[model samples]
Target chain A: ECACYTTRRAARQLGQAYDRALRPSGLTNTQFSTLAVISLSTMSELAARIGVERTTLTRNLEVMRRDGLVRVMAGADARCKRIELTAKGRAALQKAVPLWRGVQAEVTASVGDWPRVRRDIANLGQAAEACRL
Target chain B: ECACYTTRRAARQLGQAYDRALRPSGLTNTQFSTLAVISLSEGSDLTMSELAARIGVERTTLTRNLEVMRRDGLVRVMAGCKRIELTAKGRAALQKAVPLWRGVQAEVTAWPRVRRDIANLGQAAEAC
Candidate 1:
């Protein structure tokens, strides 16, 4: 229908492609991004940083916590929770980097212009206004 | 991060923008595209695979989307040959959806960079 539509379809399709490519890494595209961020961050901050809903992030974080790829603890405020990459998380990331690199190249080659797409996303203003996420 | 990540993130972000805009018209961006194609075909009958091809989605994807559209009465799958046609309501929704889509498109593309990156849309639209 429009770019919004085109972008999303391409996203789901390519997300599947990356998920398949990342299979050996045992991370979904969302999981890889979740694990990739944050030497340290609050849930809200990390969700914002990655452009996902806090709840969506929370669910993934729960899964990651169980896997011991990440750790979470209370932040300065009672409502706040902070996240960290574990030693295992770091190892997973190191292992996934080249795979990420390979898919990044091949997908762009096949599909085109996602770096620009990422920047458009990365450049977005506070997602609070956009998605209510 | 990967380009796929960027693209999907962009899709979700931008998709939310349009979904909000289209809310008043009551067409999800997905439905808008569905109706648009049915209208374009005039007799309004296209096979599932044909619609999927037009939308650049897998046939399976269109099957699911059309299921939603069918439930909403935006489209009907005919008894014979499984051709698709929009209902009168669907036609009206498209009328509303077009302007609504333009509003969000205008807003998104109005962004200085969006004009440059502008989804180029050389393909005449898809899988949105």
Candidate 2:
């Protein structure tokens, strides 16, 4: 199979695994990733770091904002909105992290040669950056 | 970043690129992939090889999806509920393959040392 096909298939399976693992935490894998990213940095920085359009991030943040998982505030500049994890968001991540790590470690152990896999994943990120459209 | 985040981002970006390339053929990347898989195998074998559950791809939904592409002269499954490729549909594959390869080659060339990248992608599959 081609890289694109294999990548897509792998993504689908990986997502299903992550989603299943995160389900008890009341988050989908996408939601979990969004929360993790937001919690890790300021909104604008997170947007840039994640290679997500700011507006799209804002839209995604809105749902979590409503769900009390995130708080959006106007930055001192007023043109910027900073995203902060609420107490609830932090709690959710605390709850989800173990679950996430459980599956992550399980995958790493099951797959074997995890160091090589991690290196390859990093390589993919580099290639993606180089070929960024 | 986590594997999930990186993978999703990659899938979205890769899909957008493939979609853009396939647009002239009146196909999304998903459509092109579907068609390519179908063209490459008997429908039953394609379903099994692709790991898609057959009943979910029942005749009606299959018929409907095929109908749209059929009117565009892109696919053919026979009447009488038997799946068979029409000559016109076979011709469309011949037409689409070159364009598909053009985009595929462009993608490979634009990314240097693509074998490493391809290997990494394969490794990601193994990892997943």
Candidate 3:
């Protein structure tokens, strides 16, 4: 049934809708997700939560820093780094949330039995994880 | 509330597993999907737009992907590179790749109903 293909296709399709919805804020869906989570946890922690490698997280975070949306600070231990949103980043997030909320609501409404579907989707990831080599 | 995030997250998670499984055959998950679809649509060639639509990718993006396969000698793009067909090499890769794909596919799809849920979720997203 090609779960990988179907899920990738759905990600692209869903991404376009979210990208369009967040256009006014000038952030792509990935960037919006990055910004949304930056304040919630440290880089590695949130990246793990979101299923991205730290290298991947840093790539996006670097861009956000350059764009003034986030600040990458030297942690008390120089080996570690901390990240926080800049005022611009917070403002952008605030601007994007309403748009994201609208799109999220529409997507959930379009899919009947979303609460159950949501659990199923989560389980699907766990199922895949079990197969990890 | 984080449906989009969770969905994309799972996609990445599943993709990594599939990519690892298909690595010996030298195909990424998306590349395998592209190759498999082309293999399935044998006899008649797929136009650029048609293949893009069928694979749920933009035509421009598909062109980018096809050129890589073309360079790898896996697929041929004829008719000024608009029509796509699997090369003998591509078919061979798929043949080697299928059993590997089946291993992971079988595991993730252990819950029978999850397959339909994924299809329906994709359909719902497509409509929106």
Please report the candidate that would top lDDT against the real structure: 3
Cα lDDT, all candidates: 0.70, 0.62, 0.83
Model 1 agreement with the true structure over A24-52: per-residue lDDT tens digits:
87878888877776743378888878887
Clashing pairs in 3: none
Over 4 Å off, model 1: A39-41, A66-68, A109-133, B79-81, B111-128
What lDDT score goes with residue A35 in model 1?
71
**Native contacts present in each candidate (fraction):** 0.39, 0.13, 0.66
- Give each model's clash number: 2, 0, 0
Candidate 1 C-alpha RMSD relative to the actual structure = 4.4
Estimate candidate 1's alpha-carbon lDDT, on a 0 to 1 scale: 0.70
Q: Give a tens-digit lDDT track for model 3, residues B1-128.
A: 47777678888889988988888999999899999899889775489988998998888999899999999999987784467888889989999999999988888877446657666666666676
lDDT of 2 by residue, A1-133 (tens): 4445545555666777788788888887877887877665556678666656677777878888888998887889877777778999899998999999877776555544656655554555445445445
- Ranking the candidates on lDDT from highest down gives 3, 1, 2
What is the CA-based DockQ of model 2?
0.26
Tens digits of per-residue lDDT, candidate 1, B18-123, equal: 7788898887777787788779897634887788877767788889988988888888887655788888888878897887788666555544444334243212
State the lDDT of candidate 2 residue by residue for B28-86, as single tens digits.
Answer: 65556556666566544333212243222324445566677677777665544355453
Ranking by DockQ: 3, 1, 2
| Candidate 3 TM-score over all chains jointly | 0.94
Better of 1 and 2 by DockQ: 1
